[PDB]
């Protein structure tokens, strides 16, 4: 429906592609080219040294860590015939997970989430996958990922990965990401447990700041988990020509995992809402106590002080002949009323 | 025809008629001397600064053969940006804004564009605009504004509007930059008022910018005879600029909402602080007050008439009760 032209930004020349993000520390290319019986695995920084792997009969996995080098991604896209808009979507990290189909390749945008126990923050790293008839290109924002198990399987010939094509490679990477989401959710569960214990025992403002940033983190997780389910659903239902039919059932399995993940999210948010409500209880209880004090004094003293005002009148015909001594009479009156009121408060259990 | 706007002072009719090699620019308050500018084949740009001057806009609309409905739309300033296409002309409603750094108030001005056959009509509330670069381009042959026809001029006007939006976004950006750290370090009712005002300004911004991007999408995706097919990529560029503006507005709104969220967190503890202060003062003074009341009654033959300096003894016992109560307070983790 659209020609899919470039972005045409402002304050930027017409043809330039800009790496949106904040990571520029490291650059590296890692190539693992594997077959039924043999495999090569090497790390370089020379882009040409990975170019001749496009026309390789056996499946290959190219991994460019560090996409701030717009020259490298541009050269790879030009060599592999990748559309410039796809290159922009690779560089543009401020984006949601998505899947796009083309006659020569399939493009996927996913997210990797890390959660440090300290500083209570969620950190996202966009990963890009391009599956071409013989190769799988990966673009990573920085050093560190979750695809180590897939590398182990390739290196030690475990499972059935070496017996299949690049579509199984794409499946393996997507499965690894989905499985890492489970460890992320376990970390979130532990953090909610300790935070809720804190709000039970220590109802302060720091707990509230932590709870609110945690709520924001869950909102972001939902916003990034729903497009993931959309992506995998399209993957095993649109069934693009590049993915073989035999590998389609496998996708379905990991899709189920995604659904499971979403369901877990549906619990966690609810739980955190409850603990926020718990906060109020705690703090309100404290305030409540400070008011009961304020009653069990004022009710004792304000009415009782009133009687003094009745005998603080500067009148002349007040009955003052009293009995015995009248100051003890007022003392008896205050004693009996104070005992009555305090007994009332005690039986009310205040 | 009623005028909703509050600007009812300025009325200037500014005509700019350019050709491939000729130009004529002048401002006058007479309309019968500028109505026949549409007759010439040279593209023309007319700017009417008076919408409160209803007679002149009615006359120019009658002379240009535009339906009275668009005149009513022009008069009604309080509106959202919009676009309509008729077989004789294209009518667009846009908005400019100005932002005051000292007084953080974002104020607006309606603009009406009417692209007719080989000319354009413009309607603006008050003097002071953002289209001076277009006028300079026409004057000095700086760009290709003179070579092309009136659709390029409508493009240039919309581009100037978008440029002004970018400038205002820069101002809101550094406002957010200062305000975020001001709230995170020194929260106070001024910071809350600033953040609420910024939120309302961003509300107005997005409510104006989304209709603008819809208008631009209608401008380039649709293929009306008023604008030539060769002017579509420029409108596409303006549409992409509007996408930029909308995304920036979304980010700013999210940041400000987070600021309000983090501010309103500690409401439940200032109430406890007031609890504590009031209960301390009452608890330590009401018994003292009633001791004074007891020893203030007018009684006859009351016991404590003169028993070894009754006043110092009463004051000492009262102070003993007070210090007991304050020791209890400091023991029970209050103050």
């Amino acid at each position, epitope marked *: 429906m659209e020609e899919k032209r470039l972005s045409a930004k*402002k304050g930027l*020349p017409p*043809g330039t592609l*800009v*790496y949106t993000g904040k990571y520029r520390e490291d650059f590296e290319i890692e190539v693992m080219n594997y077959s039924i019986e043999e495999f090569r695995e090497f790390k370089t920084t020379d882009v040409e040294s990975v170019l001749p792997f496009r026309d390789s009969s056996t499946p290959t996995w190219i991994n460019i860590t560090g996409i701030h080098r717009t020259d490298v991604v541009q050269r790879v896209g030009e060599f592999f015939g990748i559309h410039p808009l796809v290159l922009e979507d690779i560089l543009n990290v401020h984006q949601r997970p998505k899947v796009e189909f083309f006659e020569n390749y399939v493009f996927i945008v996913l997210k990797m989430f890390t959660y440090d126990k300290n500083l209570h923050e969620l950190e996202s790293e966009q990963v890009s996958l391009i599956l071409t008839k013989n190769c799988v290109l990966m673009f990573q924002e920085k050093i560190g990922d979750v695809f180590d198990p897939v590398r182990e399987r390739i290196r030690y010939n475990r499972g059935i990965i070496r017996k299949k094509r690049a579509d199984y490679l794409l499946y393996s990477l997507i499965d690894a990401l989905v499985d890492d989401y489970f460890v992320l959710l376990e970390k979130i569960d532990d953090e909610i447990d300790v935070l809720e214990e804190e709000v039970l025992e220590r109802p302060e403002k720091e707990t509230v700041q932590r709870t609110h940033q945690l709520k924001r983190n869950l909102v972001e997780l939902r916003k990034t988990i729903w497009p993931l389910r959309e992506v995998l659903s399209s993957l095993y239902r649109d069934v693009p020509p590049l993915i073989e039919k035999e590998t389609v059932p496998y996708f379905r399995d990991v899709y189920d995992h995604t659904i499971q993940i979403a369901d877990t999210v549906e619990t966690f948010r609810d739980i955190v809402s409850g603990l926020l409500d718990v906060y109020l209880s705690s703090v309100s209880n404290k305030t409540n106590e400070v008011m009961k004090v304020l009653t069990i004094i004022a009710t004792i003293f304000m009415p009782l002080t009133f009687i003094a005002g009745i005998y603080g009148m500067n009148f002349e015909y007040m009955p003052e002949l009293r009995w015995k001594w009248g100051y003890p009479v007022v003392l008896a009156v205050m004693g009996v009323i104070a005992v009555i009121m305090v007994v009332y408060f005690k039986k009310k259990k205040w | 025809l009623v005028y909703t706007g509050k600007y009812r002072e300025d009325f200037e009719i500014e005509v700019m008629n350019y050709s491939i090699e000729e130009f004529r620019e002048f401002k006058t308050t007479d309309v019968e001397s500028v109505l026949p500018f549409r007759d010439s084949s040279t593209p023309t740009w007319i700017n009417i600064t008076g919408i409160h001057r209803t007679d002149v806009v009615q006359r120019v609309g009658e002379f240009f053969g535009i339906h009275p409905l668009v005149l009513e739309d022009i008069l009604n300033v309080h509106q959202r940006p919009k676009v309509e296409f008729f077989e004789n002309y294209v009518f667009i409603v846009l908005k400019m804004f100005t932002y005051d750094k000292n007084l953080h108030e974002l104020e607006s001005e309606q603009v009406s564009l009417i692209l007719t056959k080989n000319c354009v009509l413009m309607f603006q509330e008050k003097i002071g605009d953002v289209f001076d670069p277009v006028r300079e381009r026409i004057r000095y042959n700086r760009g290709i504004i003179r070579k092309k026809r009136a659709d390029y001029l409508l493009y240039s006007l919309i581009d100037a509007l978008v440029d002004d939006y970018f400038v205002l976004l820069e101002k809101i*950006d*550094d406002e957010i930059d200062v305000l975020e750290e001001e709230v995170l370090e020194r929260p106070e009712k001024e910071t809350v008022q600033r953040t609420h005002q910024l939120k309302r300004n961003l509300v107005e911004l997005r409510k104006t910018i989304w209709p603008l991007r819809e208008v631009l999408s209608s401008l380039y995706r649709d293929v009306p005879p008023l604008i030539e097919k060769e002017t579509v990529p420029y409108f596409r560029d303006v549409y992409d600029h509007t996408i930029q503006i909308a995304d*920036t507005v979304e*980010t700013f709104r999210d940041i400000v909402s987070g600021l309000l969220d983090v501010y309103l967190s500690s409401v439940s503890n200032k109430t406890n602080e007031v609890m504590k202060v009031l209960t301390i003062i009452a608890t330590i003074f009401m018994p003292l007050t009633f001791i004074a009341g007891i020893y203030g009654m007018n009684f006859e033959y009351m016991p404590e008439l003169r028993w070894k300096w009754g006043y110092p003894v009463v004051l000492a016992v009262m102070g003993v009760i007070a210090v007991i109560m304050v020791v209890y307070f400091k023991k029970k983790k209050w103050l």
Partner: antibody
Amino acid sequence: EVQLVESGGGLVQPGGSLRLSCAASGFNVSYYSIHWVRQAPGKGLEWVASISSSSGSTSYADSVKGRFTISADTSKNTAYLQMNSLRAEDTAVYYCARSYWYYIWSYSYGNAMDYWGQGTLVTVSS
Amino acid sequence: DIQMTQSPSSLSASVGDRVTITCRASQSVSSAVAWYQQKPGKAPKLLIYSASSLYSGVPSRFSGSRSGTDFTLTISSLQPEDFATYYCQQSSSSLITFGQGTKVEIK
């Protein structure tokens, strides 16, 4: 691995002209912006020109507009600066810098200069 | 155009103390400020970009901060290799301009 080398600077008569060549190795001149910066003897840095080799979109400083020219050759990977009608206040050390783009907000973009050349001296006297 | 006024101009502070340089923009620049360091006789070396982000391969003692339209460079603990001229740079427009510079001396 990345190197920027400036050549061509030297004496020139006032009102003269000369072309400065910035040869770049370790990268392709098309993918990055190339800037010419100036520093007068005992003064501060002053920006002069900017070029995007792929598109050719030039940007000249307000002081040297219409008086300087900047170009880029991808075939030989070199950025050229033709300085015409030089005045006595153009004598300075000229630096060639390579700049990328970084992202701040969806509306605002910035650029930073990673790698600089050694800079060549240009004197306009006598 | 946009002016970037840099203060002070000849700051002097011995080794081991925090040094701050302020840089005020004549116009609103959207955090597109870079800080460079230039020793005499040699080309400048970038230190800060985006007014806060630290470059790759630069010591962490250099820091940059922005408040409104004021951008500050801080050296937490000087070293004998940190005595040079420091320059602002605004990239908010295609017409990018530098500051006057702040030579740092030995007290």
